[PDB]
Design a protein around this nucleic acid. Structure first.
Ligand code: FES
Ligand SMILES: [K+]
Ligand SMILES: [Mg+2]
Ligand SMILES: [Mg+2]
Ligand SMILES: [Mg+2]
Ligand SMILES: [Mg+2]
Ligand SMILES: [Zn+2]
Lengths: 38, 162, 177, 69, 133, 71, 42, 99
RNA sequence: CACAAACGCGUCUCAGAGAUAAUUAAUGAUUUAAUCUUAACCUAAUUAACUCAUAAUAAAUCCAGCCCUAGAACAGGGCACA
């Protein structure tokens, strides 16, 4: 993951999802796109 | 209402849909010229999470909520109804709208803690270890801001954060 | 009342036992009325110097209903004194260990902070469930009303009520629930 | 009022309805009361003794007339 | 006329003893290693009184065991009177043992060092050597 | 109203030890130490234990022997 | 089945005697609500 | 110095004590203190809090009537607001002016 | 190690259950797809604290004197056969 402030989609396959009270950027093709709102 | 039946009869699978008779809307609404069902019956700003008889007509048999397209509710009211259903389930009401799982009911757990007006979910809130003094106080939310427009007979504003 | 001097004073300053149910009642609203009875703020003969005070018996304290998400957010903290002895316990954890700790602490913080607080806390009787010794039961006088009206679940509504409430909308016949 | 009835005024009862009589007993002076004002590190002290005249009354009888509309 | 004896069950606890520490001896095993053993002697051991489960802890019953015999002339009136009813000489030290309901022993039953079989692991509780201030 | 519970200590108040010897008014007493005595009284009157201890000569002497009485 | 007096007390026996005390005061016309003694000039 | 300051506070403390007694005796009849006072003044009954406390303790029957009077007056005030406002003043709400 | 003891460099012993954070997975609705869910029910893999099972303590009211591996004083354990 990568703890960041603002979430942006690096590729078109990234999908937003709200889990545990925070928004997570989960990506299937590229695991390096995983981002976590602080 | 329509239901799907799947039958296995000797390596042959048959899938068919059957139509079940559906209850209809009541004949005379007080406000026939309304658009959305909530404001058609003068229920605008007059329901809360306690009103099970209202929230039980916009939910699926397994606890889910029907889409806004089918019901016809306005966007402003649909979010309020959605919030109330979430609060109703956490409050312990609506016991017959849970999915049936015979294997999971036997291993009982810690007794359920009674709660109501829970804005968030039980598994997504962290303890407030450092509350703070009065000039910077971390207030525990109660209820939802979407229900701050409800009629107040007392006249005092509802205390959402306490 | 034409009573004699001795029995007249005894009747005026009598002690009265109250019963207060706690089935799905917030501890704060349970403590607000319990605090008044312990101090004697309901007697028109009230005075701090006088020892006026009434016993309060609270039953079903395991079924209290904290409003909102306070079961996981509110924390009760204490220090044992020794270094590294600062313990913070969540509201859910404390109620799981000591059933009557939540109600007792709420009342213990609402009474006046003088030295009479220790004296008037001894008159408070707490029980996790409806298991009260016969001695305490024979002392009761009246039961205080519940401060919060308990809402009823869907299965508790009678069929007459279900038919009485109008059907707001007419779902289409072809939709699958 | 009495045991079985009570009369309210708006805001006073008429003189023809209830008569109250009192008798003066003692016309004395109160005990010496002390009034002192003090301010820190400014050398300001004011001590004065007040003797307030007092009067003691004895209420003898209270009568209610039977005239009531 | 002893109390009835029940068969062993899982999770059951037995009754300990009160013994006297004699000294130490060296002991050797068949692999050549050397071990030091402490000689504990049971002089006079008798169960004194039995406490019901709900009056001691609420989970396990309590069995009382006395120590070695001491003189009557240096004990309290209540202590001497208590032993007179049982019919035993006064004991030095008295300890409380937590025993399950299936291993209760009638008070006054003597106990011997054969209560422990070799190969078992046991605990020891006693006041250590006091070195003062 | 409920009937008067007249014979509640019916046998406790008047108990005959035997029909051959006169009844004995032997009030057995233990005279517990100051420790166990206070905790027995505090539990009896539903109070604390700090007020049952006596006080020093200074506080005892300064109490007014003849307090004013009204009525 | 008509109430004429009522009295408190520490115990039932003491309270019952006080109930008779109140009954006698009402019967003898010597209650605490009685008309105050007249002292006006005859 | 403490004697004079406490003398000033003596009047405040006794006033606070009376309000607690009035509230205690008013809650016994199911009426809060704020409703018991304003709805009694509207009846032109000028009784200070000192004598109301005494009536609460030594006059249980009379204090009930005053509490009954306040509740009746309060229920009349809500009736006028609920109506069009053109309702004639209530039988207990009529104002009598001495002149 | 010139006391009958103290001492290390010598010898002995050292533990079960619950519970979690990030994170991972199942079922599934708002959005009849999908989707670990500040959506519900049930359920799974999972840091350390922490809590507890459990173990220790346990007899009200002989006590002058002497002894003691008990001890500053005060207390405590012995003084029937020794
Ligand atoms: S359109 Fe009126 S409330 Fe929905
Ligand atoms: K989603
Ligand atoms: Mg030593
Ligand atoms: Mg799906
Ligand atoms: Mg423990
Ligand atoms: Mg000794
Ligand atoms: Zn991506």
């Amino acid at each position: 993951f990568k703890t960041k402030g603002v979430l942006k989609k690096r590729c078109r396959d990234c999908y937003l999802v709200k889990r545990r009270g925070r928004w997570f950027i989960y990506c299937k093709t590229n695991p390096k796109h995983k981002q976590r709102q602080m | 209402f329509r239901e799907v039946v799947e039958i296995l009869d000797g390596k042959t699978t048959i899938i068919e849909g059957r139509i079940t008779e559906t209850p209809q809307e009541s004949p005379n609404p007080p406000n026939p010229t309304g658009q959305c069902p909530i404001c058609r019956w003068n229920l605008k700003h007059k329901y809360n999470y306690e009103d099970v008889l209202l929230l039980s007509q916009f939910i699926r048999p397994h606890g889910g909520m029907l889409p806004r397209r089918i019901t016809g509710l306005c966007q402003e009211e649909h979010l309020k109804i959605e919030e109330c259903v979430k609060m109703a389930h956490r409050a312990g009401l609506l016991p017959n709208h849970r999915p049936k799982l015979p294997e999971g009911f036997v291993p009982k757990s810690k007794p359920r803690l009674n709660r109501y007006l829970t804005r968030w979910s039980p598994r997504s809130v962290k303890p407030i270890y450092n509350k703070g003094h009065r000039w910077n106080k971390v207030r525990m939310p109660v209820g939802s801001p979407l229900l701050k427009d409800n009629v107040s007979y007392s006249g005092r504003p509802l205390l959402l954060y306490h | 009342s034409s009573f004699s001097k001795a029995p007249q004073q005894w009747a005026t300053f009598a002690r009265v036992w109250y019963l207060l149910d706690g089935k799905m009642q917030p501890p704060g609203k349970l403590a607000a009325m319990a605090s008044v009875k312990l101090q004697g703020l309901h007697k028109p003969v009230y005075h701090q110097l006088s020892d006026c005070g009434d016993h309060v018996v609270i039953m079903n304290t395991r079924h209290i209903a904290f409003s909102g998400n306070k079961w996981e957010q509110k924390v009760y903290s204490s220090h044992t004194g020794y270094p590294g002895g600062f313990r913070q316990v969540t509201a859910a954890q404390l109620h799981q260990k000591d059933p009557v700790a939540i109600v007792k602490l709420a009342i213990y913080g609402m009474l006046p902070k003088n030295l009479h607080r220790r004296t008037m806390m001894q008159r408070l009787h707490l029980f996790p469930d409806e298991d009260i010794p016969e001695d305490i039961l024979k002392n009761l006088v009246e039961e205080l009303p519940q401060p919060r009206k308990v809402p009823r679940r869907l299965d508790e509504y009678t069929q007459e009520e279900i038919e009485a409430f109008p059907r707001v909308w007419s779902p289409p016949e072809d939709y699958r629930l | 009022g009495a045991d079985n009835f009570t009369l309210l005024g708006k805001p006073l009862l008429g003189k023809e309805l209830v008569r109250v009589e009192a008798t003066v007993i003692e016309k004395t002076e109160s005990w010496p009361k002390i009034n002192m004002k003090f301010q820190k590190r400014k050398n300001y002290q004011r001590k004065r003794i007040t003797v307030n005249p007092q009067t003691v009354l004895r209420i003898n009888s209270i009568e209610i007339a039977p005239c009531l509309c | 006329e002893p109390w009835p004896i029940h068969p062993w069950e899982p999770g059951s606890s037995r009754v300990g003893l009160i013994a006297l520490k004699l000294g130490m001896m060296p002991l050797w095993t068949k692999d050549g290693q050397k071990h030091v053993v402490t000689l504990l002697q049971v002089q006079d051991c008798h169960v004194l009184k039995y406490t019901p489960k709900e009056n001691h802890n609420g989970r396990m019953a309590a069995l009382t065991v006395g120590g070695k015999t001491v003189s009557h002339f240096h004990k309290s009136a209540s202590i001497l009177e208590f032993y007179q009813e049982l019919g035993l000489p006064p004991k030095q030290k008295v300890k409380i043992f937590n025993v399950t309901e299936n291993a209760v022993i009638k008070p006054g039953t003597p106990l011997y060092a054969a209560h422990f079989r070799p190969g078992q692991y046991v605990d020891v509780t006693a006041k250590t050597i006091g070195k003062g201030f | 109203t409920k009937p008067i519970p007249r014979p509640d200590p019916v046998h406790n108040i008047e108990e005959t030890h035997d029909l051959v010897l006169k009844t004995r008014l032997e009030e057995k007493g233990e005279h517990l130490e100051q420790g166990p005595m206070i905790e027995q009284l505090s539990k009896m009157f539903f109070t604390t234990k700090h007020r049952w201890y006596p006080r020093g000569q200074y506080h005892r002497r300064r109490r007014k022997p003849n307090p004013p009485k009204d009525r | 089945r008509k109430l004429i007096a009522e009295g408190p007390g520490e115990t039932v026996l003491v309270a019952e005697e006080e109930a008779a005390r109140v009954a006698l005061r009402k019967l003898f016309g010597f209650t605490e609500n009685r008309r105050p003694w007249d002292y006006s000039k005859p | 110095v403490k004697c004079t300051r406490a003398r000033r506070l003596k009047k405040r403390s006794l006033r606070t004590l009376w309000i607690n007694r009035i509230t205690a005796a008013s809650q016994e009849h199911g009426l809060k203190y704020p409703a018991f006072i304003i709805n009694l003044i509207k009846c032109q009954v000028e009784l200070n809090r000192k004598v109301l406390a005494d009536l609460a303790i030594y006059e249980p029957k009379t204090f009930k009537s005053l509490a009954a009077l306040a509740k009746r007056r309060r229920e009349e005030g809500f009736a006028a607001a609920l109506g069009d406002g053109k309702e004639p003043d209530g039988i207990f709400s009529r104002v009598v002016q001495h002149r």
